[PDB]
Design an enzyme around this catalytic site. Sequence first.
Site, short mmCIF file in Angstrom:
data_model
loop_
_atom_site.label_atom_id
_atom_site.label_comp_id
_atom_site.label_asym_id
_atom_site.label_seq_id
_atom_site.Cartn_x
_atom_site.Cartn_y
_atom_site.Cartn_z
N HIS B 219 3.05 5.29 -1.34
CA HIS B 219 3.58 4.41 -0.31
C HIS B 219 4.81 3.66 -0.79
O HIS B 219 5.72 3.42 0.00
CB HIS B 219 2.55 3.42 0.19
CG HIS B 219 1.36 4.05 0.82
ND1 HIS B 219 0.11 3.49 0.78
CD2 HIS B 219 1.21 5.25 1.43
CE1 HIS B 219 -0.75 4.27 1.41
NE2 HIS B 219 -0.11 5.36 1.79
N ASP B 254 3.62 11.07 4.16
CA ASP B 254 2.63 10.78 3.13
C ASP B 254 2.00 12.07 2.64
O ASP B 254 1.19 12.67 3.34
CB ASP B 254 1.56 9.83 3.65
CG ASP B 254 0.94 8.99 2.56
OD1 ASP B 254 1.41 9.08 1.41
OD2 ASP B 254 -0.05 8.28 2.82
N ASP B 286 -6.38 8.16 -4.87
CA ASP B 286 -6.36 8.32 -3.42
C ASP B 286 -5.44 9.50 -3.12
O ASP B 286 -4.27 9.33 -2.81
CB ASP B 286 -5.89 7.03 -2.75
CG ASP B 286 -5.90 7.12 -1.23
OD1 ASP B 286 -6.54 8.02 -0.67
OD2 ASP B 286 -5.27 6.25 -0.60
MG LIG Z 1 -4.49 4.34 -0.15
MG LIG Z 2 -1.10 7.52 1.21
#
Ligand SMILES: [Mg+2]
Ligand SMILES: [Mg+2]
Lengths: 387, 387, 387, 387
Positions: B219, B254, B286
Amino acid sequence: NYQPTPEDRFTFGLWTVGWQGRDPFGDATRRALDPVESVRRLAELGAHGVTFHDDDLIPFGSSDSEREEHVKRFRQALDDTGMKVPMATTNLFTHPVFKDGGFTANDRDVRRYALRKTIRNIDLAVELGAETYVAWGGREGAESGGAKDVRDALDRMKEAFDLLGEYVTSQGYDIRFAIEPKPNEPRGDILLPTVGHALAFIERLERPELYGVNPEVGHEQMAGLNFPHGIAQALWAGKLFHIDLNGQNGIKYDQDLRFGAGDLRAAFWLVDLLESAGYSGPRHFDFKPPRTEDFDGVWASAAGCMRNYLILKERAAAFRADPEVQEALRASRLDELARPTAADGLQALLDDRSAFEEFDVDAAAARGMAFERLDQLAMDHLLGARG
Amino acid sequence: NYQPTPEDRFTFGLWTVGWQGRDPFGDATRRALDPVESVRRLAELGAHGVTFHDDDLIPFGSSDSEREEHVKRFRQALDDTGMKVPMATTNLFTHPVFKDGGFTANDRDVRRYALRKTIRNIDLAVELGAETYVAWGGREGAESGGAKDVRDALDRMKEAFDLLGEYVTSQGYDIRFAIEPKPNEPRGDILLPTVGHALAFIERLERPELYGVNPEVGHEQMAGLNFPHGIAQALWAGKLFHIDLNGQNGIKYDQDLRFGAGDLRAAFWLVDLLESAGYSGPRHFDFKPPRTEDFDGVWASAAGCMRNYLILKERAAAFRADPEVQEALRASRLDELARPTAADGLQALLDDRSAFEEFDVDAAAARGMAFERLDQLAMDHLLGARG
Amino acid sequence: NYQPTPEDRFTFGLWTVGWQGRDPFGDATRRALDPVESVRRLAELGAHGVTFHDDDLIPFGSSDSEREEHVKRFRQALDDTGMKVPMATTNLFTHPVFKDGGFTANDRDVRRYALRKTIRNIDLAVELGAETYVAWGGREGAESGGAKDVRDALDRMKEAFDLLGEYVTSQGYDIRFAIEPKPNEPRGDILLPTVGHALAFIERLERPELYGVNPEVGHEQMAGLNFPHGIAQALWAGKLFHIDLNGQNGIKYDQDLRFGAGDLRAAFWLVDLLESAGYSGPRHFDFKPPRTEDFDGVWASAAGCMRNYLILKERAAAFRADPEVQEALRASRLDELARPTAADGLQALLDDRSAFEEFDVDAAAARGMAFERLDQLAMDHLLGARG
Amino acid sequence: NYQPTPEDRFTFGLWTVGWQGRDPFGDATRRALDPVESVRRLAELGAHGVTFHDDDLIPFGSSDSEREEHVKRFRQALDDTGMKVPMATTNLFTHPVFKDGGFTANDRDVRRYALRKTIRNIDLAVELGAETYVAWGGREGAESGGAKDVRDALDRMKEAFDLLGEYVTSQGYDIRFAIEPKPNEPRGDILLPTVGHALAFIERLERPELYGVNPEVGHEQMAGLNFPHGIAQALWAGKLFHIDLNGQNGIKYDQDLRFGAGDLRAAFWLVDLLESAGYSGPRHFDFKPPRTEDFDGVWASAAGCMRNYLILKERAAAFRADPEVQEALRASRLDELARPTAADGLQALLDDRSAFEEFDVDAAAARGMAFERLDQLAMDHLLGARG
Ligand SMILES: [Mg+2]
Ligand SMILES: [Mg+2]
Ligand SMILES: [Mg+2]
Ligand SMILES: [Mg+2]
Ligand SMILES: [Mg+2]
Ligand SMILES: [Mg+2]
Ligand SMILES: [Mg+2]
Ligand SMILES: [Mg+2]
């Protein structure tokens, strides 16, 4: 006619109209401008004030007699035109002694020299009557990972800003400080790259009431962020002290186009936000006339910035004052967004059975939001095509 | 051999290895995973813990008997494997009632429903023994300028976080909160887009000691920012409560690649920063296994994340413990960066003649910084080619 | 030891190690280099050749005696060191007469002047023994939409390249032409921005066998594209005549870092592609030593480029020659990708019942691709951690 | 009033207004639309035609009776409304058998299945009267470097397009093919990412007169390129067969906003280019109504696309037909750009002494270009503020 008036508080930098056109792949296309001539031309166009770097006004390495002579000529031009100086800044990026940094250079003696240069320019800026001092951290960063310990650099930057605040408090000046963020160019990654990083840095200072931000449209658009959201967070914090307006075409190098060029819809929403929130500072244009233009093109670009702002201000006021727009705003429930969520309190929210146990999620999900109708009304008001 | 041990504190989300492969242009390529099977497989690979959304564990619309049955099976699997749950979060983005937002939706009743859902999941997370609660503001934003008044949205988000802090204080829990920033995807522009905006928001809350950030590599790289600089500012503020590790290839959608893929040099400098600063929280991955892979590819990707972290940790420790590197760090004056600028004080700095009047700017500018030699040593230690 | 040898065909530009450090926000940090000294230093580091702009060797506005004197000294240095000149180019971007363009300027007399300057430099380049001439269209573009009619500009660029091809055919030279694409910087949008646009332009020329491309790693990464894919399409077309190697950190300004810095994984895959395809041209480095460095840092950066290439070449050869990698490549069916789709023909494909009527889509969809296992083997071979 | 007429040739995809709102982080917000109802609603708004995927019209796995029933109902709706079908395409991205690719999958049997599916849909499209067939290479790419040999993939894609051209030539159809480029999303890097790469690929085919491009505003803006430049190169090559119009906010995920949103100035210059060049194909809108909207918002977005195009077409015609604009265009020497550079020939250019020996570079460099005045006139005509 959209003619600028002195109540509009339009200001220009001396480096803006005085840019000679030297880019990284080319030589200068225009000769140098006298600052006195710049003041007279900008007063003829209808501006309110000028801003300056210290090296824009007094050349580097000047003696004290040359310093006082340049200052005397410049105050004489300001008195003849009635122009003001609402902001000043210092140059800690041009001379090769600042190649590693200024306030956060790896050399201690370079850091001390940068602080002394800034203090001398602050004295000159209060002498000319400025109200805001701008620090741009242009050389503060790194091209590689091991070159700069970032926690130590943040400690040195905190120490420098605390010393400047101590100096203005001891002298009894009323000037405030503002930080200009920028993500890259000319270092690979610049410390404090966005408005959010600058605000989070300001909250750790010793006297946080003296420091605010000075955001630029182009610099927030170089990171792909959204400038009205950034400006609105700065207004929510109460830290918007000064603003820079220009244009930018997406994520690339710093273009510094004239205002209105670049992202026109974002410019429309920005003027809507400032006129709605009642921002009362200067409207400062930080743009570069392109190096294909001669002096007539320079003055045409400077007039075009103010004209584009006045057109967008009229269209945004007409959009907000329209009854069909007000009906659409009620249909999209912006008035319900302005209402408090739980003013009855936490215990009442926990005991409210209509809020979890008996809440119809399908009936709530079936409602449309009418955002597209609202946006089409905004586009019609921007283009002038209500009909 | 780089074999993971439970002292490494490696954790995985259930949504990571349980992703079925549904992308915006395609259907699912893998069947659904049982959470019990996910716990057993991740304990076999050598992980330390799992994290969950509420909808990952208990399906939406489940009755209380189905809720307690899922919870009982999941705690049984945790007791059999010895695995822990160090973090939980709530899902306020999947169901179509949250299409406009969650905590900052335009509908008051939707905002109240989101608060009640979060409070119920916080009770479950303390029951399972979590130490950090993560709020992801995924649907909080706008695709157009007039749809969302951003100052009012920031007021509602402040009110929601203040209510959650009041609830955990009244219940006497020890859990803390963390905010995950993200610039876009799935809204056009998301509120609090970076770590800096999240930190500046946290400083305006009522009890700012309960709130921190949870940054993600991907991010921060979607906005073109530099993740070690962002992490270092969060460590300087004392707000790094939890971290998400994955990979990302530049400014696009993403991707959520496995760790080490994407920007390998930035991953190296990040592991250097965390091991140097002594961050003691979980190392949470993640990532999304790509939809071309079957279950053997899923488990190979999960092992590859931990292997890449262990390799980079060994190489960074070897780079810092090298005498030629320490000599190069002294030649680039990082030790002088760690020294205070003016500890003698403001008056002594103003009276120091060696700091402005008798400072040789040409002799200071002639010194090189040797950053390229330092970076080539870092590249040799990363590639294993010291010789 | 990774020591460069003359069989590696490493070349450097004179503008690379001769860059004085003048960026758009700062002055020069290094003095000017003699080209003779640059040849001697680069021959000591183990390079094979140098390239030049016309203005790098002969200053602008020089007389004929000064021209022949500079040429005589430069050929003397080349004969003493045994260095070669495999490529030359002309400067149509620095002087302010080219502010609107060169070959596609709006002024006819400026276009004719640019053609005459290029023809004179082509004569000098054949005199020095170059084999490739590079045209960089740096000023060919626009900052605004109405300034440049793009179809007319493409007609003028076609006319200019046809005239240059006619001249080299009439003189009987063996030199070929190459076009260097770049998306922006210094104009807002540059004509022929990528390798694909350059190739599509070349196919419309009169003698398309004389023209190829000269791609740069940084310029294709400024548009977010993938440089091995671009290089592979140029190799598939048979048009890769010359290549520029440097580094770049994502979508921003032209950084021109040393090779290996920036995207290390993409550098690995690029060296894999060139060594697999057997590209036999020069390996040209077009990088800028950062302005924080003195001359020792300049020479260290120049050595670091060649060292990083030799390390990546060894690791890529070791990755391809590994039996477990060859097994994984068979498991991901790359050998089946190399097979023809329908060599039996269209009628046989239309009559094949196993290809539509009796094809098990579920059994075909259930097979994994093992790409993650293949990529983890590639990462282990790059990092040196096979074990 | 800007009311659409059937002479405007406005077309919409069935997937555009039929999108249910399933994004990667959320479920569907709208129910499914009947294609018959979509045809009737779009004919009421004033559209000219519809386009379709094969899976939009006939669901996957349907029998022949269900196939002919869906086709019969759809042709009945087209006959009742008078609507046309000017383009069709096939779906090679949704079903999980195409997870690695379609025409360039690593599995030979998957490649043969994709060719047979495309041939069957081409027969249906000629039956409905389409004139253009669009191939979108959505799954053709890679997330990692070793997964896909790109030269072999280009060989398979060339073989597939040659087989399709052989089939339409043997059947005697008049339909042509068009390739839609896109840089990423949903693979990490897609083959043929821009218009330039697509054009360079088309020139290597066996029958290059049957193939053109189908560019999309959003897809060229996801790579930071400039869409009027790309469209103008495609028009210069004579390959613009079809066009997709939507909006996009900079470099991020595929937003597919309605036309006019996103970059309004670029939309203005695009409409200027198409009306000036006399492009006579369909004006196809490929947008997604945002998932916050119900069906009234869907139909309002569809009307807003056509309204924004008609407003921009009127303003661009008024800008070109203005005498002060024509004077400014002569002052910026666009008429001199349209003139040939050397029509007298190479020998006359080499003997012209006014072109190199007696050319005043300072007098040529002193002339301004007046581009800023031209751009301010364009901005005034776009905003409606001529006065
Ligand atoms: Mg995350
Ligand atoms: Mg992400
Ligand atoms: Mg700027
Ligand atoms: Mg500025
Ligand atoms: Mg470059
Ligand atoms: Mg180059
Ligand atoms: Mg699209
Ligand atoms: Mg499309």
